[PDB]
Amino acid sequence: DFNVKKLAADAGTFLSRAVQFTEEKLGQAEKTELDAHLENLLSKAECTKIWTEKIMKQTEVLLQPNPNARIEEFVYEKLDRKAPSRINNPELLGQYMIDAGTEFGPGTAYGNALIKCGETQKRIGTADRELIQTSALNFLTPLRNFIEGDYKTIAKERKLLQNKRLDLDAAKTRLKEFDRQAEITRLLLEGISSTHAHHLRCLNDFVEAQMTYYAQCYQYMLDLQKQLGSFPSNYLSNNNQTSVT
Amino acid sequence: DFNVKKLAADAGTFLSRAVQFTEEKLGQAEKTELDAHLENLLSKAECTKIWTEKIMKQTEVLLQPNPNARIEEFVYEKLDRKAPSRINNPELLGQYMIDAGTEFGPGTAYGNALIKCGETQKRIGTADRELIQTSALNFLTPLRNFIEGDYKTIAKERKLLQNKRLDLDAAKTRLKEFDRQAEITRLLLEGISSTHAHHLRCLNDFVEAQMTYYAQCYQYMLDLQKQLGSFPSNYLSNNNQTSVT
Amino acid sequence: DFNVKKLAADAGTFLSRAVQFTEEKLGQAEKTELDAHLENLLSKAECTKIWTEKIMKQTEVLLQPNPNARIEEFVYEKLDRKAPSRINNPELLGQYMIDAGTEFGPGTAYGNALIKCGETQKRIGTADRELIQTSALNFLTPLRNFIEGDYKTIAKERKLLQNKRLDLDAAKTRLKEFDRQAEITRLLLEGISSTHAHHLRCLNDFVEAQMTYYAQCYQYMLDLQKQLGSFPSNYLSNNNQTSVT
């Protein structure tokens, strides 16, 4: 009983090639840091940058674990131009089930039953349609615009710091603009380090955006025991058959 | 604004070729029925047979909308012989978020925060693991064993009825075993027609098996506002920064 | 459901080419203003000029949404020389209906009914004839004569201000009549800015000129329930038929 995680690790190559299938996580970011006063600040900065970046991709497989439907989510547009709709699976469950309860027979308990169940799956499909938007606008869009916004400024200032530090070192070694560039870089690194009530703001709203789906569709799904309860109450008194209460 | 459903129908070929991708629904069953006393009874029988068959496939895309993970669900075995585990997507979220909250830094609010969030996604992943079993044993397995059980008897008796009806007609036309075969066939058709507290039994348990996921993971997800509420209560009194309540 | 305004925007090219069809609105006017003391005063002046101009054209499609009948309205003349009459559509509704109630039969309820209805449409057509005149003389004619009157003076004074400002600048730059022209221009701009109880005077009369059509033709149209009410009162007592009250 040792291959129980040996070949599970060997199939973990397939599980991490499904991670490599359309680029899911793949590592963390990097290890290399600055000189040892902005060591952990640049570490917190770049791990903050990729921690902002990777959970967008990982929440996109939460919204769409289909391969094609992950390509329809990423664009920020709310119009039809290059983004089709996801085939919602309880919609595809009620789309046949309404016509199946129709063509079953209207004068049975099943005509009063399966039409209600296919209506219930169709009303459940609206929850799967509205699940993919609040993460698209509170976790994909503002973190994406913080990636395509102020993170370019932090990367530009540290890229020019890594250019001007060697200029300062080659100036000060050859005896007989490090300061301003280091100041704007260290200001952006300390702004991403200390002044960081932005990622907890999206995370505390992300857990509530996950949370405000479940009890609503739950308390909708209690109503099918009220709607379908006619057959344990009046169809049990049929002279043809007595059945399950 | 008329192409708004014209090219939506033309992409409905792609949406129904994703139905044709690993065989999702594809029609209903058939139209052809018997002579006009077992017309609607054979209609209810064959539409009952395919109505038992198709929602198994449609609930399998509810359990797994991944293409590979639909192949790992169908077998009734619960061991490891020819069915690997599904890569659960909130497991893949808390599998890197725990090490990211570790390597972020332990002496911050984020060390007390993102470790809690990655723990929350890991405890949410157990719900996605337990979602795929009660439909596998109350909707896949008994409907599958009713397909591979008594439906073979109904199909065999109607197949021999369609053999012996022409024998009776060719016997009674040529002047100068229809009855027993028609009796067992009509008994199986009326047993699938009237005595049918089997599909409502799996449907009323199927809606509760859907239902008993949501409020449980909901009331787990209210506890992260209790666990993460330390930062709107004690970290707001920091002399470095006042932040969001 | 995203093409629901994507192809509505793509047909908005046809809706704005119907704006381009005989020149309906087309933009606002312009953006370019003077130096930053007569910036907003010239903005208010030119937007006032085009705001005087464009609602004349837009009220002309309110009076005549026919394409030919918009060409018959614009000229200020009240005589026949180059302006024919509009084919009024309730006149064209009563023109057949009077001869149709005549040739229907005089000895029926329909002879006492459809002649009354075709008379009602003919008396309704006088309201469509008188709708197109009070906007032609309170919104087309005085705003048009304020366009072809004092607006030429404002445009002439600002055109000579834009000529003499560069003359003042080229005079005062070359060391070793801006004032009078700027005074008459700034007087006309402040007269169109502050002293502007002219466009509210036509607008408050324009909304009443719209308003004094509706209740008059309404309270005419209540009289057809008095004139046509003979058939729910005396024709119901016919021995041939009892009918709708």
A79 and C CB contact within 8 Å: yes
Q: Which one-letter amino acid corresponds to residue C231?
A: F
Q: How far apart are CA C222 and CA B183, in angstroms?
A: 73
The length of chain C in residues reads: 245
Give CA–CA dist A114/A229, Å, rounded.
13
In contact, B211 and B59? CB cutoff 8 Å:
no
- Give the chain A residue nearest B244 (alpha carbons): A197
Contacts of A72 (CB under 8 A, 6+ apart): A64, A83, A84, A85, A86
* Nearest alpha carbon to residue B73 among B140, B21, B125, B128: B140
A81 contact residues in C (CB cutoff 8 A): 2, 6
Structure tokens at A211: 């949370």
Nearest chain B residue to C8, by CA: B1
Measure the CA–CA gap between A219 and C208, rounded to whole angstroms: 54
Touching check for C15 and chain B: CB below 8 Å? no
Nearest to B21 by CA among A69, A240, C84, C47: A69
Give the amino acid at A97: M
What is the DSSP code (8-state) at residue C66?
S
d(CA C6, CA B202): 44
Hey, is the C-beta of A103 within 8 angstroms of any chain B C-beta? Answer: yes
Contacts of A65 in chain B (CB under 8 A): 64-66, 69, 89
What count of other Cβ atoms lies within 10 Å of the Cβ of residue B32?
8
Residues A186, A169: Cα–Cα separation, whole Å: 18
Rounded to 5 degrees, what angle do the CA atoms B224, B230, B232 make?
100
DSSP per-residue codes, A159-215: HHHHHHHHHHHHHHH----HHHHHHHHHHHHHHHHTS-TTHHHHHHHHHHHHHTTHH
Partner-chain contact B67 A67, CB within 8 Å: yes
Closest CA to B200 of A231, C91, A157, A134: A231
- Is A225 close to B204, i.e. CB distance below 8 A? yes
Q: How far apart are the first and last CA of chain B?
A: 47
CB-based contact C122:C98 (threshold 8 Å): yes
CA pair distance B55, B73, nearest whole angstrom: 14
Distance spanning both ends of chain A, measured CA to CA: 47
Per the CB < 8 A criterion, the answer to whether A185 and A161 are in contact is: yes
B4 at the C interface (CB within 8 A)? yes
Cβ proximity of B161 and B122 under 8 Å: no
Q: Do A83 and C2 touch (CB under 8 A)?
A: yes
Closest by CA position to B29, among listed B9, B11, B52, B1 = B52
Residue of chain A with shortest Cα separation from C9 = A79
Number of other residues whose CB lies within 10 A of the CB of residue A64: 20
